[PDB]
Amino acid sequence: MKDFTTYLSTAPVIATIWFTFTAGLLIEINRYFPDPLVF
Amino acid sequence: GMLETPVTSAPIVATYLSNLPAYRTGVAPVLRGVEIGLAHGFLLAGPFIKLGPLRNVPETAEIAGSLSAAGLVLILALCLSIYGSAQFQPLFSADGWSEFAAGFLVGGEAGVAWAYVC
Amino acid sequence: DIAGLTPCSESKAYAKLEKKELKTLEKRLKQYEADSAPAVALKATMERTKARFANYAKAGLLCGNDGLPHLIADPGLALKYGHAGEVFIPTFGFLYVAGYIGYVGRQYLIAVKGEAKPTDKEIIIDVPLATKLAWQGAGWPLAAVQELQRGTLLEKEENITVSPR
Amino acid sequence: KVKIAVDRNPVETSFEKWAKPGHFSRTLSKGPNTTTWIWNLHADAHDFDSHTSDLEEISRKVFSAHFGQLGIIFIWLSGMYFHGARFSNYEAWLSDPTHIKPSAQVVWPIVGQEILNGDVGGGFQGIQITSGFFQLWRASGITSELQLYTTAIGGLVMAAAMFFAGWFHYHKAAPKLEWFQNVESMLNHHLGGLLGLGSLAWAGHQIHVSLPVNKLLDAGVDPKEIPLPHDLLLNRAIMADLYPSFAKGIAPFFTLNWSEYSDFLTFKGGLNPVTGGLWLSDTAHHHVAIAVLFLVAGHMYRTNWGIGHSMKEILEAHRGPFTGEGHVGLYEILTTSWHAQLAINLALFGSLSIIVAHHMYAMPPYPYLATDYGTQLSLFTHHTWIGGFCIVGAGAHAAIFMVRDYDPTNNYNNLLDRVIRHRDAIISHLNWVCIFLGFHSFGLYIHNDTMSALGRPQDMFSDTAIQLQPVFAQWIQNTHFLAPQLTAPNALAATSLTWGGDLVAVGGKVAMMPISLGTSDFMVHHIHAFTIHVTVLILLKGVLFARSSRLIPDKANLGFRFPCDGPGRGGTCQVSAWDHVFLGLFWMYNSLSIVIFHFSWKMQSDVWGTVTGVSHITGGNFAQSANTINGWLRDFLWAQSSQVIQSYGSALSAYGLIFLGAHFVWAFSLMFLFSGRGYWQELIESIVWAHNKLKVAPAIQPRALSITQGRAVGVAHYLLGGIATTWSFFLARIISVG
Amino acid sequence: HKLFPKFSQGLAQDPTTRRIWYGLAMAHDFESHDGMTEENLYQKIFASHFGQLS
Amino acid sequence: WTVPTLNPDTPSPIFGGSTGGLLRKAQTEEFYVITWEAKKEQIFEMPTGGAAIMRQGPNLLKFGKKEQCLALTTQLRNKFKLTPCFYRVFPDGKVQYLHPADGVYPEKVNAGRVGANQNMRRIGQNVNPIKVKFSGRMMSPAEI
Amino acid sequence: AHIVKIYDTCIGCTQCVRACPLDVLEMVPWDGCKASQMASAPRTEDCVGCKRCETACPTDFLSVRVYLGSESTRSMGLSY
Amino acid sequence: GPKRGSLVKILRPESYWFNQVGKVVSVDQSGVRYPVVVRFENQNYAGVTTNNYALDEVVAA
Ligand code: CLA
Ligand code: CLA
Ligand code: CLA
Ligand code: CLA
Ligand code: CLA
Numbered sequence A: 001m002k003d004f005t006t007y008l009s010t011a012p013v014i015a016t017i018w019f020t021f022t023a024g025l026l027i028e029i030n031r032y033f034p035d036p037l038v039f
Numbered sequence B: 001g002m003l004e005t006p007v008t009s010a011p012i013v014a015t016y017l018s019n020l021p022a023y024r025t026g027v028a029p030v031l032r033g034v035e036i037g038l039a040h041g042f043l044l045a046g047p048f049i050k051l052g053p054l055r056n057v058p059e060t061a062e063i064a065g066s067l068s069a070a071g072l073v074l075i076l077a078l079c080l081s082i083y084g085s086a087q088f089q090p091l092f093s094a095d096g097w098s099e100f101a102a103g104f105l106v107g108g109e110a111g112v113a114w115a116y117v118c
Numbered sequence C: 001d002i003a004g005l006t007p008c009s010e011s012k013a014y015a016k017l018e019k020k021e022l023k024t025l026e027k028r029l030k031q032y033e034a035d036s037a038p039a040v041a042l043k044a045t046m047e048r049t050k051a052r053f054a055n056y057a058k059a060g061l062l063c064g065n066d067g068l069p070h071l072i073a074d075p076g077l078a079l080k081y082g083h084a085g086e087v088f089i090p091t092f093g094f095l096y097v098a099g100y101i102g103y104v105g106r107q108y109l110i111a112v113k114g115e116a117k118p119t120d121k122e123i124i125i126d127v128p129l130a131t132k133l134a135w136q137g138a139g140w141p142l143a144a145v146q147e148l149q150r151g152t153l154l155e156k157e158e159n160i161t162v163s164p165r
Numbered sequence D: 001k002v003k004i005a006v007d008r009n010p011v012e013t014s015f016e017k018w019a020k021p022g023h024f025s026r027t028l029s030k031g032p033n034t035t036t037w038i039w040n041l042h043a044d045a046h047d048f049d050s051h052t053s054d055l056e057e058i059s060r061k062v063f064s065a066h067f068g069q070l071g072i073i074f075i076w077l078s079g080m081y082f083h084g085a086r087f088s089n090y091e092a093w094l095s096d097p098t099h100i101k102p103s104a105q106v107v108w109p110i111v112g113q114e115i116l117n118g119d120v121g122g123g124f125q126g127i128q129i130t131s132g133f134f135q136l137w138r139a140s141g142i143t144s145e146l147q148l149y150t151t152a153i154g155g156l157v158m159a160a161a162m163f164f165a166g167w168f169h170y171h172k173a174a175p176k177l178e179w180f181q182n183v184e185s186m187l188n189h190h191l192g193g194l195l196g197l198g199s200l201a202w203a204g205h206q207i208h209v210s211l212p213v214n215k216l217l218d219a220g221v222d223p224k225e226i227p228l229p230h231d232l233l234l235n236r237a238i239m240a241d242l243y244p245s246f247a248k249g250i251a252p253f254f255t256l257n258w259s260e261y262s263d264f265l266t267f268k269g270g271l272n273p274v275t276g277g278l279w280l281s282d283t284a285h286h287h288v289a290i291a292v293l294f295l296v297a298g299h300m301y302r303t304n305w306g307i308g309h310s311m312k313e314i315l316e317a318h319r320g321p322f323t324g325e326g327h328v329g330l331y332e333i334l335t336t337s338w339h340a341q342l343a344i345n346l347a348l349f350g351s352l353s354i355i356v357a358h359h360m361y362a363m364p365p366y367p368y369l370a371t372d373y374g375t376q377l378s379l380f381t382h383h384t385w386i387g388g389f390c391i392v393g394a395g396a397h398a399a400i401f402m403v404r405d406y407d408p409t410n411n412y413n414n415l416l417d418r419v420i421r422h423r424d425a426i427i428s429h430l431n432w433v434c435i436f437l438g439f440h441s442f443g444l445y446i447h448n449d450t451m452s453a454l455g456r457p458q459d460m461f462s463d464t465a466i467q468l469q470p471v472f473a474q475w476i477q478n479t480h481f482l483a484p485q486l487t488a489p490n491a492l493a494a495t496s497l498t499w500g501g502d503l504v505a506v507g508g509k510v511a512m513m514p515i516s517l518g519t520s521d522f523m524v525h526h527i528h529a530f531t532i533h534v535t536v537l538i539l540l541k542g543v544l545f546a547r548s549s550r551l552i553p554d555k556a557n558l559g560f561r562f563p564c565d566g567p568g569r570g571g572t573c574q575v576s577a578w579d580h581v582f583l584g585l586f587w588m589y590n591s592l593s594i595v596i597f598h599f600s601w602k603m604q605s606d607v608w609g610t611v612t613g614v615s616h617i618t619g620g621n622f623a624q625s626a627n628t629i630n631g632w633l634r635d636f637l638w639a640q641s642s643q644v645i646q647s648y649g650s651a652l653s654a655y656g657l658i659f660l661g662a663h664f665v666w667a668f669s670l671m672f673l674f675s676g677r678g679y680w681q682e683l684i685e686s687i688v689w690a691h692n693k694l695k696v697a698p699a700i701q702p703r704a705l706s707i708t709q710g711r712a713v714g715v716a717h718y719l720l721g722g723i724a725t726t727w728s729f730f731l732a733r734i735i736s737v738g
Numbered sequence E: 001h002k003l004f005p006k007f008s009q010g011l012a013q014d015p016t017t018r019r020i021w022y023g024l025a026m027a028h029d030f031e032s033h034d035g036m037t038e039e040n041l042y043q044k045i046f047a048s049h050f051g052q053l054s
Numbered sequence F: 001w002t003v004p005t006l007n008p009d010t011p012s013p014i015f016g017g018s019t020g021g022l023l024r025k026a027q028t029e030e031f032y033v034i035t036w037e038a039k040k041e042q043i044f045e046m047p048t049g050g051a052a053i054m055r056q057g058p059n060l061l062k063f064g065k066k067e068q069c070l071a072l073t074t075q076l077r078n079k080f081k082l083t084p085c086f087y088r089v090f091p092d093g094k095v096q097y098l099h100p101a102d103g104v105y106p107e108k109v110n111a112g113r114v115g116a117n118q119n120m121r122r123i124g125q126n127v128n129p130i131k132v133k134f135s136g137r138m139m140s141p142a143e144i
Numbered sequence G: 001a002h003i004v005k006i007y008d009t010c011i012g013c014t015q016c017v018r019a020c021p022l023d024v025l026e027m028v029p030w031d032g033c034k035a036s037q038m039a040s041a042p043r044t045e046d047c048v049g050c051k052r053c054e055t056a057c058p059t060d061f062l063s064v065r066v067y068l069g070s071e072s073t074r075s076m077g078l079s080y
Numbered sequence H: 001g002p003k004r005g006s007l008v009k010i011l012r013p014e015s016y017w018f019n020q021v022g023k024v025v026s027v028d029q030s031g032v033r034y035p036v037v038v039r040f041e042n043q044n045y046a047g048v049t050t051n052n053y054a055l056d057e058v059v060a061a
C-alpha cells in the first residue's frame, strides 16, 4: 500500500489527476456560469 | 570471390559479347563507329516519326522525324567528342575516340537516311 | 463611443445576429415533438442564447459594424469609459494565478534541492510537501516582493556561462 | 513429445516495482539525471529482448502482453456495443435503414459543442458514425438494444477474463520455453480450433439465427414482431416454414443427401436486390466450406502420434541446384527469434487487411452497406492504412532480426545467405525499375500537364488522344463476368457487379455498378506500382544492408537504432535500418494517400450516385480529368474540399476544426524533420541560464531530444497530420454529399 | 590532379564529384583562397563590384 | 619483431562469392590484403556481407577500403582471439605493411613510438581565427 | 586529409584508440599523466573523420579533436 | 592543493562545470599537469561526472 501510494505519487499519475481536477473545475465553472467573456 | 550467375558466365553470352562491334579488338575505331551509328540511327528514326508533334500530318511526319533523329545523332556525336576530350588527355585513346566519334556521326546520319529512304 | 464603435445594446447588427441565431435554432426545432429530448435540448440552447446576448448587452460591450463585441486594451481609456472588466481585471487575475503556479513550483524546487535525492523528489512527487506549498502559495506577491527586496530572489554570477561569456 | 510445461509462481505480484520507474533496465534503474531518461523509459519499456537474454522469460512477457492487448480490445468492443445500445438510434434505423443515418455518439450540452448533435433522423440527435456497426448488427440478426447491452456485459466480462489470464500466465503459472516452441502443435490448434471452429460456430449462428431474422427483415415484418432467436432454435416448425429443408432435420447431413440443403446453402452470387448486400445463404455456405477446409488443414503436423508432417523435414526436403542448401536453418530461425515471426506475420496481416479493404468494397457483405457511401469510404480507407502500417512494421522487425538474431554459423550457404550475398544486384535492379516506373508513370502526367497548358490536347495521353487502354485488366474483367456461363456452371450470377452486368440499387442510390478501366485507370495503377516498388526498395535495402555496407562495414555492432557514424567519410546520417523504416513510413504515406484518393474519386465519379439514368456524385469527370495533376488539384482536392471548408455553423464543423488542426500538426512536424538537436540544445542552454538566474533550474537536466527521437517525433506528427487531414476531408465530403 | 578550381588545390585534389559543387560554392569567398593577401582581397572585391554594376 | 612479407600464394577462406567485393579501385588505385593464421576451421562473418569458413592455418582475404580490414580484424580479434595483419597493395605490386605497424597493437604503449600531432596545451589555449587570417590556405587556429 | 590533434589533458585511458575504426591513433610514452601514456595521431592520412575517438574521450573538454579538412579517396571512405 | 572531500569551484572556462561547485576526490603529488580529481553531482553531455583540473583552475569555495 505504501508502494501503491508511491506509484500514485509518480509524475504521470499526478499529472493525470491534477489535470483531471483542473479541467473538471473549469468545466463545472463553464456549466454553472455559461459563456463568460468579461469581468 | 565473385558471384556466379548464368547471365555473367555463359558461353553463348561470351560469344555474343565478343561478336558485338564494341569488342572485336583489331577492327578500326572508324569501322566500329560507322557500324554502331548504322545500328543506332536506324533504330532512333522510328519513335520521332510515329509519336512526334507532326505525326498526324501526311508526307511530313517522316521528314520531321528523320530530321529530329539526325539532330539527336549530331548531339550524340558532340557528346562522344567531349567525352573523349575529357577522358583521354586503340579505341581507348584520344585519336582513336575522335575517329570513333566521327564514324558514329557518319554512320548515324547514314542510318537515318536509310531509315527514310524507306 | 470609443473608436467609432456603437454600444451593443444600441447596435443593429447585434440584434440581427441574435435574431439570425434564433432563426437557425427554431428551424432546427420545428421538426421534432414537444416533450422529446431533442426539443428540450434545443429549447435549453435557445434559452442560453437569449441569456448570453442579454448578458453581453448588459455588460456594456462595444460592437462594430459586424455586431460583435470589441475589447478595449488601454488602462486609462478602459477605466475612463467603464471597460476594466474585459482586459484589466482579467490581466491582474491572470498574473495572480500565474505567479501562484510559478511561485509554488519555485518553492518546491528549493525544498527538494536540499536533500540527497533531488531528482528522485522530482520524478516521484512529495505529495504532502507539494500540498503544503500549494496552500502556502496564496501570499506569493508579498513573499515575492520580500524575496526581491532581500536580494534572495536572484542568483549571483555563479551561473553556468559559455566560453565567450 | 508435446505436453504442457509450466513453472509455478515465478514472479510475485507486488506493487514494489510499480514504485521504481525503469526497474526493467539495468541502465535506467539508476534513476534520472537528465530528461533523456524519461524518453528512454518509455521507448524501451516493451523491448523485452533488451531486458533479458533468456528466451523463456521474453516469451512469457510477450504472452501476457498479448493477453493485455486482447483485454483492451474486449473493453473497446464492449464500449461500442454499450454505446450502440444506450446512446444510439439503432432501432429507428432498423425500422428505416434508407432514410436514417447511423449515429451512436452524443455530446453533452456545454461550451456550444451541442451543435455537433445533428439531425440524423429517428427522433435522435448525434454524430453520424461510419464504422459500420449498425450494418454488422443487422446482419447478425440483432434487433433490440437489450441484446447489444448483454453483448456489452459479455465483452466486459471477457476483458476481465483476459486480464486475469495475463496476470495468471505471468505471475502464477507461466509457460515454459518448450511449451512456446511447439509450433507444429500451435499450427494444428490454431488452424483447427481458431479458424476452423470459429467459422464453424459462426456458420452455426448464421444458419440458425441470421438467415431467418434477416429473411423476415427483407420480407418487411416489423423487427419487434419478428420471433426472438431462441424460439427459432426451439421450434423447428418455424424454420421449416421459412426453409422446408429444416423439416428433414440433420438426416440429409448424415445420409450425405446434402443437395436438400439448397434452401439456405446457396451459390447465387451478386447482391440481394432489395438489400444491396451479399446473400446470407451464400455467406453461410461459405463459412461451412471454410470451416471444413480449415479443420482438414489443422491435422497436418505430427504431435504426440506418428501421423502428421514435420516442419523441419518439409523445409529441409526442398533443395535445388540453384539455391544450394535451400530452406535449411529456417526452422531454427523461426522457432528462436520473435522478430522474424513478427516480420512474417506483420507482412501477411497487413497485406490481408488491404485485401479485406478491396474485397469488402467490391462485394458488400453487409445489408444497407453499399449505399452508406460514408461507411464504404471509411472502411476501405481505414483498413488500407492499417495494412500499410503493418507492412512497414514487417520491414522494421525483419531488420531487427537481421541485426540482433542473425547468426551465420548456423546459417552458412542458405537462402538468406545468398540473398545477403547478391544484395547489390537486388538493390540495383530494384533501383533501376523504380526510376523507370517513376519516369514513365509520372512523366505521362507531366507530359499531359504540358500539352494541356500549351493548347494541344490532341497530343495528350487520354481516351480521345493517344490511348493507353488496360487491355489485360479489361480481359480479366470480361472473363470474370463470363465465368458463370462456362467455368462456374453452378453460379447464378457473377461474384461481383464490378465485372459487368446490370445494376443493383437500393432506396434510389446505386449500390454497385460495372466499373470501367481506361487510360486514367492505367495511369493510376502504374503510379501505384511505382510507389509500392519504391517503398519496397527502401525497406528491403534497409533489411539487406542492416548489418554491413561498403560505407559502414561493421554497421551491425552499432545496433538497429542509431543516429549515424559521424560526419566523416563524407557523412553517414541515416545509415541505420531504423532510418530506413523512417523513410519507408513517409513513402508508405505517399503511396496509400494516392491509393485512397484513387478510390474516393473513382467511386464518386463512376459508381455512386442516385438513380432517377444514374446521376453520379461528380458527374463522371474521372475519365477525362484524372490524366493531369491540375485535374486532380482542381476537380478532386479543390472541388471536393467545399464541404469541409464550409462546414462551420453545422454538425460537421468538427471536421473543419480537425481539417485545420491536422494541417497545423503536419506543419508542426516539419520543425523536427528539418532541424537538428544541436541548435535546440544550445537554445535550451540559454533558457537554463534564465532559469538559473531565478533559482528555478530543475535537478533533472533539460536536454534536447536525441537525433533519432527528433526523427521519430517528426514522422509521427507528419503521419498524424496528413492522415487526419485526409480523414476530415473524406468524412465531411461523403457525409454532406451522401 | 585537376585544374578546376584554380583557387583551391585542396579542392583540386578531390577525386569525387564534390569538387565541382564546392568549386561552384567557394568561388566568391575570396578570404579563403590560396595565396590570398589583403590588398588582393580588396582589389578582387572592387572588380566584382564593377561586374555587379555592369 | 621484423616487418613480415605478403605471401600471395596463401589459401583463402571458403566463400561462394559476393557482389560486394572489389571494384575498379582495386585495379587502378589500391586494394588491401588481410592475413591471419587460425587454430581451427570455423565460420566467421564477411564484412562485405555473407558467411565464410576460415581454413585451419594461413588465411587470406582482399578488400577494397581500410575500414573493412579493421572490421574483420576487430571481429577476428575480439571473437576468435586471433592476431591478423593487413597490408596495402598497389597495381604496381608495391606492398605496404601496416597494423600492427610497430608489431605491437596500438591499444597499448610501446617504447619507441614517436608522438605525432600532439598540441602541448589545452583546447582553450588556442588562438582566435583573426590571428590566422590570410595564410596560404584555410587554416584552423589549432593547426599552429 | 583531416586534422587530428591531441591535447595535454589526455589521461591515457586508450578509449579513443580502441574506438577508431581505421587504426590512426596510438599510445606513446609520456610523463604528463598518472597513466604515463599519451595519444598520438601519426596516420591521419587514413582518417575519415567519423569522430568515434571524440565520442570515446572522457575528459571535459575533449583531448582529441578532429577538424574536417580536404577530402581524398581514403578520407571519403570510398571503396571505388 | 585542496584536501580530499572539500568543495571547490571550477574556473576552467571551457569546462562543462565552469563557475559551479564540485567535490575533490584526490590530488596527485607527481609532476602530472592536472592532478586535482573533482566529482560533480550532475553529468555533462557525455554522461561523465568526473574531471581532472589544475591547481589554478580550482578555488576552494
Ligand atoms: C503600452 C503602451 C501604451 C500606449 C500606446 C497607450 C496609449 C494611450 N494611453 Mg495608456 N496607459 C498605459 C499603456 C499605453 N497606453 C499603461 C501601462 C498605463 C498605466 C500606467 C496607462 C494609463 C493611461 C491613463 C491614465 C490614460 C492613458 C491614455 C492613453 C491614450 C492617450 C495618451 C498617449 O497618447 O500616450 C502614449 C502612451 C504611452 C507613451 C505609454 C505610457 C502611458 C502613460 C504611463 C500614461 C499616459 C497618460 C497620458 C499622460 C494622459 C493624456 C491625457 C489625454 C486626454 C491627452 C493613448 C491611446 C489617456 C486616455 O485615456 O486618452 C483618451 C489617459 O488618460 N493611459
Ligand atoms: C494488477 C495486479 C498486478 C501487480 C501488482 C503486478 C506487478 C508486477 N508485474 Mg504483472 N501482470 C499483471 C498484474 C499485476 N502485475 C497483469 C494484469 C498482466 C497482463 C498485462 C501482467 C503481466 C506482466 C508482464 C509481462 C510483466 C509483469 C511485471 C510485473 C512487475 C513489475 C511491473 C511494473 O512494475 O510496472 C507497472 C506497469 C504499469 C503501471 C503499466 C500498466 C500497463 C497497462 C497494461 C497499460 C494499459 C493502458 C492502456 C494502454 C490505455 C492507454 C491510453 C492512452 C493514454 C495511451 C510487478 C511485480 C514485469 C516483470 O515482472 O519484470 C521482471 C513484466 O515483465 N506483469
Ligand atoms: C485450439 C485451441 C486454441 C485456440 C482457439 C487458440 C487461440 C489463440 N491463441 Mg493459441 N495456443 C494453443 C491453442 C489454441 N490457441 C496451443 C495448444 C499452444 C501451445 C502450442 C498455443 C500457444 C499460443 C501462444 C504463445 C499465443 C497464442 C495466442 C492465441 C490467440 C491469438 C489471438 C487471436 O487472433 O484470436 C482471436 C481472439 C479470440 C478468439 C478470443 C477468444 C479466446 C478464448 C480464450 C478462446 C481460446 C481458447 C483457449 C485456448 C482456451 C483457454 C482455456 C483456459 C481456461 C485453459 C488466440 C486466442 C497468442 C495470444 O494472443 O496470447 C494471448 C499468443 O501469443 N497461442
Ligand atoms: C457449429 C455450431 C452449431 C450448433 C451449436 C448447432 C446447434 C443446433 N443445430 Mg445445427 N447446423 C449447423 C451448426 C450448428 N448447429 C450447421 C453448420 C448446419 C448446416 C449443415 C446446421 C444445420 C441444422 C439443421 C437442418 C438442424 C440443426 C439443428 C440444431 C439444434 C439441434 C441439433 C442436435 O440435435 O444436436 C445433437 C445434440 C447435442 C449435441 C446435445 C448437446 C450436449 C448436451 C447439452 C450435453 C449436456 C451434458 C450435461 C452433463 C447435462 C446438463 C446438466 C446440467 C443441467 C446441470 C441445435 C441447436 C436442428 C434444429 O433444431 O433446427 C432449429 C435441425 O433441424 N442444425
Ligand atoms: C515532388 C516531390 C518529390 C520528387 C519529385 C522526388 C523524386 C524522387 N525521389 Mg524523393 N522524397 C521526397 C519527395 C520527392 N521525391 C520527400 C519529401 C522525401 C522525404 C521522406 C523523399 C525521400 C526519398 C527516398 C527515401 C527515396 C526517394 C527517391 C526519389 C527518386 C525516385 C526515382 C524516380 O522515380 O525517378 C524518376 C524521376 C521522377 C519521378 C522525377 C520527375 C521527373 C520528370 C517527370 C521528368 C524529368 C525530365 C526533366 C523535365 C528534364 C529537365 C530538363 C532541364 C534540366 C533543362 C525520385 C528522383 C528514391 C530513389 O532515389 O530510389 C530510386 C528513394 O529511395 N525520395
Ligand code: CLA
Residues within 6 Å of the ligand: B047, B048, B051, B052, B053, D439, D440, D441, D442, D443, D444, D446, D447, D450, D458, D459, D460
Ligand atoms: C517521362 C515519361 C514520358 C513519356 C513516355 C513521354 C512521351 C512522349 N512525349 Mg512527353 N514529356 C515528358 C515525359 C514523357 N513523355 C515530360 C516530363 C515533359 C515536360 C518536360 C514532356 C514534354 C513533352 C513535349 C513538349 C512533347 C512531348 C512529346 C511526347 C511524345 C513524343 C516524344 C518523342 O517523340 O520522343 C522520341 C522518342 C524517343 C527518344 C524514344 C527513346 C526511348 C526508347 C523508346 C526506349 C527504348 C528502350 C528499349 C525498350 C530497351 C531495349 C534494350 C534491348 C534492345 C537490348 C511521346 C508520346 C511530344 C508530343 O507532341 O507527343 C504527342 C512533344 O512535342 N513531351
Ligand code: CLA
Residues within 6 Å of the ligand: E024, E025, E026, E027, E028, E029, E030
Ligand atoms: C552585398 C551583397 C553581398 C556580398 C558582396 C556578399 C558576399 C559573400 N557572401 Mg553573402 N549574403 C548576402 C549578401 C552578400 N554577400 C545575402 C543577400 C544573403 C542571404 C541570402 C547572404 C547570406 C550568405 C551566407 C549564408 C553565406 C554568404 C557567403 C558570402 C561570401 C561567399 C559567397 C560565395 O562564395 O557563394 C557562392 C554563391 C552561390 C554558390 C549561390 C548558389 C545559388 C543560391 C543558393 C540561390 C539559388 C537559387 C537559384 C538561383 C534560383 C533558380 C530558379 C530557377 C527556376 C531558374 C561572400 C563574402 C558565405 C560565406 O561567407 O562563407 C563563410 C556564406 O556561407 N552570404
